[PDB]
Design a protein around this nucleic acid. Structure first.
Lengths: 94, 113, 131, 56, 84
RNA sequence: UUCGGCAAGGGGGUCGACUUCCAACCCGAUGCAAACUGCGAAUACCGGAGAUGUUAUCACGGGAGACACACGGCGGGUGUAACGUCCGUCGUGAAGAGGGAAACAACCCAGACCGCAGCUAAGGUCCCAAAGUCAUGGUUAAGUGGGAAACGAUGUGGGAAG
RNA sequence: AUCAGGAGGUUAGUGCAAUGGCAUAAGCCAGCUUGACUGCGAGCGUGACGGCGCGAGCAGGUGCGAAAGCAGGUCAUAGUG
RNA sequence: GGCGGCCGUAGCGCGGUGGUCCCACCUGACCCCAUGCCGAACUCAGAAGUGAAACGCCGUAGCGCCGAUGGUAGUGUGGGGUCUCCCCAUGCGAGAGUAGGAACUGCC
């Protein structure tokens, strides 16, 4: 169970995203049936190394957004072109 | 535009719809003959009479002949004039000439339509 | 250069051909190239034949991009002659982030040495990718 | 209504936008005008939003 | 005899069509607008073509088809000024 | 226009079976189109309401010039390419002076009555030259002060990751 | 070759280049029939300019149809001074 | 089955189940009437036999088409640098992916 810290995407845009990616942070979306979809900001360094560990997609990741966990599983990961990094990842509550 | 399924069967008539009136459909069954005064926008039946209902009056012989087709026309039209309709077009989808449909139309006029 | 394709005259043949590798298992490895560029079939052969001639240890070497864009030349005067099919044959279009050669192999890379020899034959700085 | 005040100068400003302001009645910096809230007025103020400071 | 050289459409000059009859003004029952020939159906304002929609208006006149499968070839249903 | 599997046809080799090659079809994975497209902009455009502008908008009549343009930007078509041809939109050269760019038709700022005072634009502030040889911090040593390319580089500095 | 069944929006065919349209069809087969009528206007070709053409009426009257209606030649855009 | 209302997410494939009221299939062609060669078409008559084509219900969403929650490329429009080229401001936002819908409603 990988514990990761995160926040909420308030300024949803490409410009704001590039300012986060420069500080090592990327956007992400979490959905879960009856649960309302949520957009958050994850830590680049932390996730990048964890997503490298195969078990990452099968675990019940404990994402703590601001002050509370959510528990989800990785779905797909959109990678960046010119500079190999994380662009956007999808998640599903578990 | 393309020809609708109804247009392919030419059972309908768009030329009678450009006017904005009513129709006079004539259905025929090897046992009974029906007639109706339907108005545009769906199947709005104002008045109708069946040859089987002609028995209510005093019909003895079969109800699948020509004389019975004329009797129904007078009934459907008589009820139509009671409704408030004056004019009407003949709509016999698929049939020959001098048949029972012509006797139905000739009967409709005899009433006042 | 507008992407030309069919409805044209028959030119030369593919200097390329040998797809190589066993087509029983589909994988997702690769050798990406950072930058768009046009590579002719005559070059693809040199690079492909370079690695294949090195990966004699095994196989599973495959190429995804094939030369499909025709390019003509007009060696003569000028006024007359749009363009014939000479040395400039089929040319392939590579995207800034496209994988050309991917060999189905798990961390036992004996092809990195092979991809290196080929990387020096095609015009464009390519990089080795594990994913 | 809304009070429009020219904050930016004429130098550098794009034409037409300059004609717009000349329209509202402003031909110098600091000048202020009162425009009622109506469809067009809103469109013009929108085009000159960068050059002026509006508020109702 | 036949046709050859795997080619597509065949070209010539510039189109000979206009935009006569914007419609919001009077208009005798006649071909409103011009593009392609031979078409009937619309007898009033019936501007209806696949898209954001279409329109026309005001003018009491029996009949008045369109040009053809173009600016609303479909035949809607009646329409006059408001009170002819 | 890539690969695998199945069925039918033709040719060759050893046995009326099998193996190999080629073309057409179907299924699951692999790739494309200036005259394709289930989709689909921005955007240009007709008409009508809310600014700006006023005898305008418009009608009639008199006199025209003019039908060898060019360049920058954006979008192009042709061409190996061109201070190339040939289009389109727009701003200019042509009547843009003034200022900067060392000098310079179209690059940047900007658009002029005379005289006078003041403040700025561009640009510039070591000296020639008016104005700081100004403030905080860092890098380079080559005087690099930048044609200078594809390509190469433990010359050296900064940052991140195993 | 033809005949019987099945699949089959249609890739056929529709005089002529090409696009567009069409199947209980504007395509095929068969039968019947033959409006390519006379007269006169309104409209259409940014921006004026003829012949010519076309779309849409009216008046009278030919052909076909039960009738609405359909023709001013051949589905439309070359076949002319 | 009868009789209404709303009145184009009801294209096109596929599964289960029920009615001897209604309805076509079906059966029979004496006659009205009709087929260039054929009551097949056309038109008339009776009900032996089913539900197999329909219909009533109800279960899959394949594929078409119409809506909805999530997001990056792409793209206007106006200033910045830079060898080219790229960037910023501002109005929006490919396809892939997760879900929605296979009629509705009253009366006898």
């Amino acid at each position: 169970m990988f514990t990761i810290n995160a926040e909420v995407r308030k300024e949803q845009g490409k410009g704001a995203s590039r300012r986060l990616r420069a500080a090592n942070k990327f956007p992400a979306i979490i959905y879960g049936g009856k649960e309302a979809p949520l957009a958050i900001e994850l830590d680049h360094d932390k996730v990048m190394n964890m997503q490298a560990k195969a078990e990452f997609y099968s675990e019940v990741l404990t994402i703590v957004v601001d002050g509370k966990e959510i528990k989800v599983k990785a779905q797909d990961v959109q990678r960046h072109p010119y500079k190999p990094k994380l662009q956007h990842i999808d998640f599903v509550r578990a | 535009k393309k020809s609708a399924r109804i247009r392919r069967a030419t059972r309908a008539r768009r030329k009678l719809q450009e006017l904005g009136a009513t129709r006079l459909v004539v259905h025929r069954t090897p046992r009974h003959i029906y007639a109706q005064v339907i108005a545009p926008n769906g199947s709005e039946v104002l008045v109708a009479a069946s040859t089987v209902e002609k028995a209510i009056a005093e019909q003895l012989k079969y109800t699948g002949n020509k004389d019975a087709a004329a009797a129904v026309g007078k009934a459907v039209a008589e009820r139509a004039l009671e409704k408030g309709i004056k004019d009407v077009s003949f709509d016999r989808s698929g049939f020959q000439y001098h048949g029972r449909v012509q006797a139905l139309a000739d009967a409709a006029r005899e009433a006042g339509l | 250069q507008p992407k030309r394709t069919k409805f044209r005259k028959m030119h030369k043949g593919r200097n390329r051909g040998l797809a190589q590798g066993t087509d029983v298992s589909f994988g997702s490895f690769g050798l990406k190239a950072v930058g768009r560029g046009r590579l002719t079939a005559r070059q693809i052969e040199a690079a492909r034949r370079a690695m294949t001639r090195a990966v004699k240890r095994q196989g599973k070497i495959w190429i995804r991009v094939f030369p499909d864009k025709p390019i003509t030349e007009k060696p003569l005067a000028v006024r007359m002659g749009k363009g014939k099919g000479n040395v400039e044959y089929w040319v392939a279009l590579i995207q800034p982030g496209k994988v050309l050669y991917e060999m189905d192999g798990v961390p036992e890379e004996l092809a990195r040495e092979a991809f290196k020899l080929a990387a020096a034959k095609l015009p464009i700085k390519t990089t080795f990718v594990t994913k | 209504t809304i009070k429009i005040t020219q904050t930016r100068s004429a130098i550098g400003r794009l034409p037409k936008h300059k004609a717009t302001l000349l329209g509202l009645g402003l031909r110098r910096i600091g000048h202020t005008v009162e425009r009622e809230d109506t469809p067009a007025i809103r469109g013009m103020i929108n085009a000159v939003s960068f050059m002026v400071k509006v508020e109702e | 005899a036949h046709k050859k050289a795997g080619g597509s459409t065949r070209n010539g000059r510039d189109s000979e069509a206009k935009r006569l009859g914007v419609k919001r003004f009077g208009g005798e029952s006649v071909l409103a607008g011009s593009i392609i020939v031979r078409q009937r159906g619309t007898k009033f304002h019936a501007g209806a073509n696949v898209g954001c929609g279409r329109d026309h208006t005001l003018f009491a006149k029996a009949d008045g088809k369109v040009k053809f499968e173009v600016k609303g070839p479909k035949n809607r249903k009646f329409i006059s000024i408001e009170a002819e």
